[PDB]
mmCIF file of all heavy atoms in Angstrom:
data_model
loop_
_atom_site.group_PDB
_atom_site.id
_atom_site.type_symbol
_atom_site.label_atom_id
_atom_site.label_comp_id
_atom_site.label_asym_id
_atom_site.label_seq_id
_atom_site.Cartn_x
_atom_site.Cartn_y
_atom_site.Cartn_z
ATOM 1 N N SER A 30 0.822 -1.224 0.000
ATOM 2 C CA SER A 30 0.000 0.000 0.000
ATOM 3 C C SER A 30 0.847 1.262 0.000
ATOM 4 O O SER A 30 1.981 1.283 0.489
ATOM 5 C CB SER A 30 -0.991 0.054 1.161
ATOM 6 O OG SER A 30 -1.923 1.082 0.884
ATOM 7 N N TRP A 31 0.273 2.316 -0.585
ATOM 8 C CA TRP A 31 0.772 3.679 -0.532
ATOM 9 C C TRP A 31 0.591 4.265 0.874
ATOM 10 O O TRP A 31 -0.524 4.506 1.331
ATOM 11 C CB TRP A 31 0.102 4.557 -1.606
ATOM 12 C CG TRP A 31 0.360 4.189 -3.044
ATOM 13 C CD1 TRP A 31 -0.596 3.808 -3.921
ATOM 14 C CD2 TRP A 31 1.596 4.281 -3.829
ATOM 15 N NE1 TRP A 31 -0.035 3.600 -5.164
ATOM 16 C CE2 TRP A 31 1.300 3.939 -5.181
ATOM 17 C CE3 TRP A 31 2.923 4.683 -3.555
ATOM 18 C CZ2 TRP A 31 2.252 4.002 -6.211
ATOM 19 C CZ3 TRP A 31 3.894 4.749 -4.577
ATOM 20 C CH2 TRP A 31 3.560 4.416 -5.903
ATOM 21 N N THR A 32 1.718 4.571 1.512
ATOM 22 C CA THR A 32 1.855 5.209 2.827
ATOM 23 C C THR A 32 2.568 6.557 2.652
ATOM 24 O O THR A 32 3.273 6.755 1.660
ATOM 25 C CB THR A 32 2.627 4.283 3.789
ATOM 26 O OG1 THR A 32 3.919 3.999 3.299
ATOM 27 C CG2 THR A 32 1.918 2.944 3.994
ATOM 28 N N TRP A 33 2.356 7.509 3.567
ATOM 29 C CA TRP A 33 2.920 8.860 3.471
ATOM 30 C C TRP A 33 4.238 9.007 4.241
ATOM 31 O O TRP A 33 4.357 8.637 5.408
ATOM 32 C CB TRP A 33 1.850 9.861 3.908
ATOM 33 C CG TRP A 33 2.263 11.297 4.003
ATOM 34 C CD1 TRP A 33 2.507 11.978 5.146
ATOM 35 C CD2 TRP A 33 2.334 12.278 2.926
ATOM 36 N NE1 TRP A 33 2.723 13.308 4.843
ATOM 37 C CE2 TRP A 33 2.502 13.566 3.508
ATOM 38 C CE3 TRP A 33 2.165 12.217 1.529
ATOM 39 C CZ2 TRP A 33 2.419 14.748 2.756
ATOM 40 C CZ3 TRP A 33 2.086 13.391 0.757
ATOM 41 C CH2 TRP A 33 2.191 14.654 1.371
ATOM 42 N N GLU A 34 5.246 9.542 3.549
ATOM 43 C CA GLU A 34 6.644 9.604 3.959
ATOM 44 C C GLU A 34 7.088 11.061 4.205
ATOM 45 O O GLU A 34 8.147 11.509 3.760
ATOM 46 C CB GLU A 34 7.454 8.840 2.887
ATOM 47 C CG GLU A 34 8.758 8.198 3.375
ATOM 48 C CD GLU A 34 9.640 7.820 2.181
ATOM 49 O OE1 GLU A 34 9.391 6.742 1.598
ATOM 50 O OE2 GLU A 34 10.541 8.622 1.855
ATOM 51 N N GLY A 35 6.261 11.828 4.927
ATOM 52 C CA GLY A 35 6.538 13.217 5.297
ATOM 53 C C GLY A 35 6.047 14.223 4.258
ATOM 54 O O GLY A 35 5.295 15.129 4.607
ATOM 55 N N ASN A 36 6.514 14.079 3.008
ATOM 56 C CA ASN A 36 6.137 14.932 1.864
ATOM 57 C C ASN A 36 5.751 14.195 0.571
ATOM 58 O O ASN A 36 5.185 14.831 -0.321
ATOM 59 C CB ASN A 36 7.299 15.915 1.577
ATOM 60 C CG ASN A 36 6.848 17.323 1.206
ATOM 61 O OD1 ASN A 36 7.402 18.306 1.665
ATOM 62 N ND2 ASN A 36 5.848 17.470 0.361
ATOM 63 N N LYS A 37 6.019 12.887 0.463
ATOM 64 C CA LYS A 37 5.700 12.044 -0.700
ATOM 65 C C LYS A 37 5.062 10.728 -0.250
ATOM 66 O O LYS A 37 5.217 10.315 0.898
ATOM 67 C CB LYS A 37 6.962 11.806 -1.565
ATOM 68 C CG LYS A 37 8.201 11.406 -0.739
ATOM 69 C CD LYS A 37 9.429 11.022 -1.580
ATOM 70 C CE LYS A 37 9.256 9.733 -2.392
ATOM 71 N NZ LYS A 37 9.012 8.565 -1.527
ATOM 72 N N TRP A 38 4.349 10.060 -1.159
ATOM 73 C CA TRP A 38 3.825 8.709 -0.936
ATOM 74 C C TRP A 38 4.904 7.655 -1.254
ATOM 75 O O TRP A 38 5.829 7.917 -2.024
ATOM 76 C CB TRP A 38 2.547 8.503 -1.775
ATOM 77 C CG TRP A 38 1.374 9.378 -1.415
ATOM 78 C CD1 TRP A 38 1.004 10.500 -2.080
ATOM 79 C CD2 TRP A 38 0.349 9.180 -0.384
ATOM 80 N NE1 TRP A 38 -0.143 11.023 -1.518
ATOM 81 C CE2 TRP A 38 -0.609 10.235 -0.488
ATOM 82 C CE3 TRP A 38 0.073 8.174 0.569
ATOM 83 C CZ2 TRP A 38 -1.748 10.315 0.328
ATOM 84 C CZ3 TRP A 38 -1.078 8.233 1.384
ATOM 85 C CH2 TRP A 38 -1.980 9.307 1.277
ATOM 86 N N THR A 39 4.760 6.444 -0.705
ATOM 87 C CA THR A 39 5.634 5.284 -0.968
ATOM 88 C C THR A 39 4.879 3.962 -0.809
ATOM 89 O O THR A 39 3.963 3.873 0.011
ATOM 90 C CB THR A 39 6.838 5.285 -0.018
ATOM 91 O OG1 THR A 39 7.696 4.236 -0.400
ATOM 92 C CG2 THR A 39 6.439 5.074 1.446
ATOM 93 N N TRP A 40 5.230 2.954 -1.613
ATOM 94 C CA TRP A 40 4.598 1.637 -1.599
ATOM 95 C C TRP A 40 5.312 0.672 -0.651
ATOM 96 O O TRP A 40 6.523 0.471 -0.749
ATOM 97 C CB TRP A 40 4.587 1.017 -2.999
ATOM 98 C CG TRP A 40 3.754 -0.224 -3.089
ATOM 99 C CD1 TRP A 40 4.223 -1.490 -3.075
ATOM 100 C CD2 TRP A 40 2.304 -0.337 -3.191
ATOM 101 N NE1 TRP A 40 3.164 -2.377 -3.154
ATOM 102 C CE2 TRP A 40 1.957 -1.717 -3.217
ATOM 103 C CE3 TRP A 40 1.252 0.593 -3.289
ATOM 104 C CZ2 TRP A 40 0.626 -2.150 -3.311
ATOM 105 C CZ3 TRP A 40 -0.082 0.174 -3.438
ATOM 106 C CH2 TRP A 40 -0.397 -1.196 -3.436
ATOM 107 N N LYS A 41 4.536 0.000 0.200
ATOM 108 C CA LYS A 41 5.010 -1.024 1.128
ATOM 109 C C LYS A 41 4.717 -2.441 0.618
ATOM 110 O O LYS A 41 3.569 -2.861 0.533
ATOM 111 C CB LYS A 41 4.364 -0.752 2.494
ATOM 112 C CG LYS A 41 4.912 0.515 3.178
ATOM 113 C CD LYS A 41 6.415 0.392 3.486
ATOM 114 C CE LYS A 41 6.862 1.102 4.769
ATOM 115 N NZ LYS A 41 6.889 2.572 4.653
#
Side-chain angles (χ1 to χ4, degrees):
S30 194
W31 296 118
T32 60
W33 175 256
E34 208 196 278
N36 219 137
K37 47 174 293 299
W38 296 100
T39 186
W40 190 259
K41 290 297 214 287

